[PDB]
Amino acid sequence: GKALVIVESPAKAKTINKYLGSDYVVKSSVGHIRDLPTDERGALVNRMGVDPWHNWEAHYEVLPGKEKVVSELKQLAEKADHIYLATNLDREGEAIAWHLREVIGGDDARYSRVVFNEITKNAIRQAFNKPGELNIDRVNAQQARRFMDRVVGYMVSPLLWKKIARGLSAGRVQSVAVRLVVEREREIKAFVPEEFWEVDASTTTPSGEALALQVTHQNDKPFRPVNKEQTQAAVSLLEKARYSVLEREDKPTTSKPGAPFITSTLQQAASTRLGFGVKKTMMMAQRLYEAGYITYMRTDSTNLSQDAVNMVRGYISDNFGKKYLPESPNQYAAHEAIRPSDVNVMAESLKDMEADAQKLYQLIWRQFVACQMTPAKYDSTTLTVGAGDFRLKARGRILRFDGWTKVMPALREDRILPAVNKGDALTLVELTPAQHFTKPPARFSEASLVKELEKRGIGRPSTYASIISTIQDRGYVRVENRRFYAEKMGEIVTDRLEENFRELMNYDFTAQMENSLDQVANHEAEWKAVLDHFFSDFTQQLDKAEKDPEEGGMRPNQMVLT
Numbered sequence: 001g002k003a004l005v006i007v008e009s010p011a012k013a014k015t016i017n018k019y020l021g022s023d024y025v026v027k028s029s030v031g032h033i034r035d036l037p038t039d040e041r042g043a044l045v046n047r048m049g050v051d052p053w054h055n056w057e058a059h060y061e062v063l064p065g066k067e068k069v070v071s072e073l074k075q076l077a078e079k080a081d082h083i084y085l086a087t088n089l090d091r092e093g094e095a096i097a098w099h100l101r102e103v104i105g106g107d108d109a110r111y112s113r114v115v116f117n118e119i120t121k122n123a124i125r126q127a128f129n130k131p132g133e134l135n136i137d138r139v140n141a142q143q144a145r146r147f148m149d150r151v152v153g154y155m156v157s158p159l160l161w162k163k164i165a166r167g168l169s170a171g172r173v174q175s176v177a178v179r180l181v182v183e184r185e186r187e188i189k190a191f192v193p194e195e196f197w198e199v200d201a202s203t204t205t206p207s208g209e210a211l212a213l214q215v216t217h218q219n220d221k222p223f224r225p226v227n228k229e230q231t232q233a234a235v236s237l238l239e240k241a242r243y244s245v246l247e248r249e250d251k252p253t254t255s256k257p258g259a260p261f262i263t264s265t266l267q268q269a270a271s272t273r274l275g276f277g278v279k280k281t282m283m284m285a286q287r288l289y290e291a292g293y294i295t296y297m298r299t300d301s302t303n304l305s306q307d308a309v310n311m312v313r314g315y316i317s318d319n320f321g322k323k324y325l326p327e328s329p330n331q332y333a334a335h336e337a338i339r340p341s342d343v344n345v346m347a348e349s350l351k352d353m354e355a356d357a358q359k360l361y362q363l364i365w366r367q368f369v370a371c372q373m374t375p376a377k378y379d380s381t382t383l384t385v386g387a388g389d390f391r392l393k394a395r396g397r398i399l400r401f402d403g404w405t406k407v408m409p410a411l412r413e414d415r416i417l418p419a420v421n422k423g424d425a426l427t428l429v430e431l432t433p434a435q436h437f438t439k440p441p442a443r444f445s446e447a448s449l450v451k452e453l454e455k456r457g458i459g460r461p462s463t464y465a466s467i468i469s470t471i472q473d474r475g476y477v478r479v480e481n482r483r484f485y486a487e488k489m490g491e492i493v494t495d496r497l498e499e500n501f502r503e504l505m506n507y508d509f510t511a512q513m514e515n516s517l518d519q520v521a522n523h524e525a526e527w528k529a530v531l532d533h534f535f536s537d538f539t540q541q542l543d544k545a546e547k548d549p550e551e552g553g554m555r556p557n558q559m560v561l562t
Contacts, residue, residue: 033062085114153169178471179505203428247383263298517530
């Protein structure tokens with residue numbers, strides 16, 4: 001018979017069907033088919049679905065209402081000559097393929113695992129031209145992640161209900177992300193703004209043009225009065241000083257476009273530019289991807305394929321001109337960045353996509369095109385003025401060539417200092433002192449927390465959104481006005497966990513676990529051994545935590561009154 005191709009959703013099924021001949025039979029499994037439920041204890045093991053004491057034996061079970069889907073897959077499998085597992089390219093997608101193969105049954109030789117980073121004619125063609133085999137190491141890396149999460153969640157939570165409060169949840173990485181928010185909260189609560197002043201001067205050039213300056217030095221030392229008294233004293237001197245142009249430095253400068261997007265940078269840009277939260281961004285990215293408009297949205301690679309670069313350079317040449325095309329392609333640094341699958345498809349032409357999804361595509365499209373255009377050129381000028389023992393400065397910049405900024409929305413800049421030569425005298429018109437106060441560390445946004453997680457090597461493209469989502473509906477942290485606030489229970493739990501689960505809460509150790517998972521995926525470590533070491537250290541932490549506080553156990557959430 002024909003060949004059976006299995007995907008995770010109706011949308012992917014529809015799009016891929018356009019690139020698969022009649023000798024194929026596309027079918028979506030509609031989400032996961034199997035998964036986990038929802039010294040030792042049977043009740044605990046049964047709920048977890050995994051057994052840490054019996055070499056990690058797991059008990060997966062068909063999801064509700066999926067019993068029908070399995071039957072349909074089997075009957076389709078029998079009539080099929082070969083089976084192609086066309087799940088997404090990440091570790092989760094490899095695991096989903098594994099579950100499908102495991103459920104449908106039959107000899108492994110009957111299966112193939114195709115990989116593609118976008119759903120287009122050529123990508124699907126190449127993907128099925130040389131279909132690969134399921135990679136057990138990647139599947140094991142994904143299961144290891146799931147198992148460790150399940151252990152912390154199901155084993156730490158019961159301790160929290162007894163010690164702190166019923167209903168509380170615990171997350172392996174979730175707890176660490178909350179710690180970051182809590183530390184930021186305490187920094188802000190303890191912040192004491194420092195006072196500092198600035199003095200600007202309005203002057204006139206010999207011709208009569210206006211020239212604004214800021215005082216930079218006094219007696220050849222950084223000028224920064226800390227109060228009104230010191231500034232007035234400075235103002236008194238500046239009011240009587242003779243001003244003259246000390247030096248004029250005119251130098252060409254440039255601005256470079258950013259690299260194409262990756263998961264983390266897309267989330268930050270969409271948040272800062274479009275006001276989209278991480279959940280909205282990733283849900284819309286998925287829709288754009290499954291519809292065949294962009295490359296896979298879970299990635300940390302800024303690489304661009306040769307064809308993709310040729311495609312965009314052709315566009316830049318035809319639509320902007322040779323001055324916007326670099327001599328050679330820009331190479332930023334298997335996987336690929338998040339980009340339009342067809343540069344000739346505009347955001348306005350997308351079908352079945354809501355307005356905000358078109359806005360996200362536009363953001364992705366502009367970033368992609370811009371990253372292959374020439375730098376913007378400016379003529380920067382810096383005027384240094386002398387006034388008695390004071391030194392003042394003025395900065396200006398004139399755009400010479402827009403370059404890559406041409407593909408971004410037109411400007412609503414301000415500057416262009418007047419013409420002046422060394423030795424020119426300036427007439428003082430007015431002095432304007434200003435009081436300022438240092439500000440407290442900025443609060444995390446959903447995307448900027450992801451930025452922090454990535455910086456510390458804690459997240460992963462496939463888990464940033466889930467981490468952000470999970471830490472919220474738990475009463476530990478909350479988002480208000482698009483920013484995170486640590487809740488009191490978040491601080492209470494964080495302190496308890498840092499005290500009794502120091503290793504688990506440590507940033508470097510958590511980052512190291514991500515590395516361990518990568519080692520399992522690359523056959524540099526064995527999953528059950530990694531899990532044994534993890535469980536060994538964990539149980540030690542947990543055993544001590546369950547003890548009374550007088551013997552080092554976790555502190556109860558209470559205040560004992562006489």
